[PDB]
């Protein structure tokens, strides 16, 4: 948890989130349900698609081994060929193993960052009209119906519209 | 009324290794190493190989009496030879 | 034996003939395409 979102203040994943990596859950008088964030998921798909494609192209021109025959009087020459092919394979094995380990750390941390950005995007948009419960959820001080929830999901919350109603409930 | 931010999870058990953590469960993973072979010496691009068998390269070229089946060979993709 | 795959790596035998993927000595090479799996609360 480099960014503290996955396994951090959001301690559990969602099994009902089936149409995207990341998204929202809401619950009001009308009902409740999940909704994947397609835009953030698509951007994540772009990095992983390019990250793997870049991996293939780099080791595209890896060293290739060719069999050779040497007589019993060419022990030194045969040893050179043996140590060259073994040495090159050891170098390329290290590079392939290291790249996978380094990218796995990068990929898991990249996925961690996107939730923190998504969590902060909603928080900075509902500045004062909600409570920050600290477990990844926000509690509204006003009535937020499906049209209001959908505005929060697509980044079009009308803070001045609910500014007056929220503060009356917040104060008392 | 509440809204929450959360992340996808499933019943996967695929495990990957990171720079400083081992056996990390991930929702989806891809293995990019091939470890399976049919175990048979097939033809390459539809061109059968040249099977010398018990006969050697010098024996085939010199025309060894025990390599009479190699006195005329067609095009080959690769040559198959024994260690001894 | 023969190799029938689309993956870019293999560890069967260093000596290969034809259009073959790149040989490495690693036992496994698994990339994580998805995020970490955390059990439901």
């Amino acid at each position, epitope marked *: 948890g480099l960014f503290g979102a996955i396994a951090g203040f959001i301690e559990g994943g969602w099994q009902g989130m*089936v*149409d995207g990596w990341y998204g929202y859950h809401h619950s009001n008088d009308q009902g409740s349900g999940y909704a994947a964030d397609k835009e953030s*998921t698509q951007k994540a*798909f772009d990095c992983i*698609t390019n990250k793997v494609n870049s991996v293939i192209e780099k080791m595209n021109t890896q060293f290739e081994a060719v069999g050779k025959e040497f007589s019993n009087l060419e022990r030194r020459l045969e040893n050179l060929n043996k140590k060259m092919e073994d040495g090159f394979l050891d170098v390329w094995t290290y590079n392939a193993e290291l790249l996978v380990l380094m990218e796995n750390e990068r990929t898991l941390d990249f996925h961690d960052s996107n939730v923190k950005n998504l969590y902060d995007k909603v928080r900075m948009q509902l500045r004062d009209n909600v409570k920050e419960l600290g477990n990844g959820c926000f509690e509204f001080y006003h009535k937020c119906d499906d049209e209001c929830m959908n505005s929060v999901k697509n980044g079009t919350y009308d803070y001045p519209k609910y500014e007056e109603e929220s503060k009356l409930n917040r104060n008392e | 009324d509440q809204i929450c931010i959360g992340y996808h999870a499933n019943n996967s058990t695929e495990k990957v290794d990171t720079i400083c953590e081992r056996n990390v469960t991930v929702t989806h993973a891809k293995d990019i190493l091939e470890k399976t072979h049919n175990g048979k010496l097939c033809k390459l691009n539809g061109i059968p190989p040249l099977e010398l068998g018990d006969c050697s390269i010098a024996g085939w070229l010199l025309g060894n009496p025990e390599c009479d089946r190699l006195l005329s060979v067609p095009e080959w993709s690769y040559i198959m030879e024994k260690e001894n | 034996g023969a190799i029938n795959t689309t993956l870019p790596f293999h560890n069967v035998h260093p000596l290969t003939i034809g259009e073959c993927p790149k040989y490495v000595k690693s036992e496994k090479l698994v990339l994580a395409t998805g995020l970490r799996n955390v059990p439901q609360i």
Partner: antibody, heavy 120, light 108 residues
Framework: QVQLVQSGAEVKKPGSSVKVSCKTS????????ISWVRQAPGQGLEWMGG????????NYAQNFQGRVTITADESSSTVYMELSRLRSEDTAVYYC???????????????WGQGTLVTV | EIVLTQSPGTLSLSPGDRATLSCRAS???????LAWYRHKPGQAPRLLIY???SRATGIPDRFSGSGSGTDFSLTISRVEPEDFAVYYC?????????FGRGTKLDIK
């Protein structure tokens, strides 16, 4: 350089099923949603259904609900379509179309398959 | 379910004539999600225009289109010998993903 390869032409009889495949190249794993669009000769193209890239969620048109089953295997990056209970006027050319994104919604068909002709 | 009505139907032209194809929608297409495809018989359809205002990659400059609401159009300033096929318009802003009637271009 992305191409979609489908199965061959098939002939069937009413009451049977069809299994049309569509394998996509250009990458290790499929990252774009694939849908199925058919064109009956003398009629226009119709949308049958589609499958999301990684999560495998499937959406079907109300006309073909209960008769079409679209499945994909992540190992082979192939998409299959299974149309059951064949009847008259099910003769058409089936194309597999690749969406511009990972999801069916708000995405257009970047590329199309060459097409398979199925007769009942 | 948005039904798309393509008006011209048949449009016989010669290389050089301006080609204007009109696609009409029963109800407004959200976010102007409409695309145009070229489907020569015996070949897989190819994407010409997506979003009603954006040209697809590799498409020659002569292909362009514009529109909004329920009215969309495709314009080909200069007709070439390869511009004779059936042209469809789809809307991808609604769930059913409906398709247009299609218009074949003939040789005068």
């Amino acid at each position: 350089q992305v191409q979609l390869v489908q199965s061959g032409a098939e002939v069937k009889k009413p009451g049977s099923s069809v299994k049309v495949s569509c394998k996509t190249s250009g990458g290790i794993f499929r990252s774009n949603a694939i849908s199925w669009v058919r064109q009956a000769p003398g009629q226009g193209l119709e949308w049958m259904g589609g499958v999301v890239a990684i999560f495998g969620t499937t959406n079907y048109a109300q006309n073909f609900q209960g008769r079409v089953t679209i499945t994909a295997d992540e190992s082979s990056s192939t998409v299959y379509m299974e149309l059951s209970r064949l009847r008259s006027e099910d003769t058409a050319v089936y194309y597999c179309a690749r969406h511009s994104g990972y999801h069916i919604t708000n995405t257009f068909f970047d590329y199309w398959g060459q097409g398979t002709l199925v007769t009942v | 379910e948005i039904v798309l009505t393509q008006s011209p139907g048949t449009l016989s032209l010669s290389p050089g004539d301006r080609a204007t194809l009109s696609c009409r929608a029963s109800q407004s297409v959200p976010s102007s999600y409409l695309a145009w495809y070229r489907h020569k018989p015996g070949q897989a359809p190819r994407l010409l225009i997506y979003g009603a205002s954006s040209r697809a990659t590799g498409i020659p400059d002569r292909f362009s289109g514009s529109g909004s609401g329920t009215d969309f159009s495709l314009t080909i300033s200069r007709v070439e010998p390869e511009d004779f096929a059936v042209y469809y318009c789809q809307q991808y802003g609604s769930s059913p993903y409906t398709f247009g009637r299609g218009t074949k271009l003939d040789i005068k």
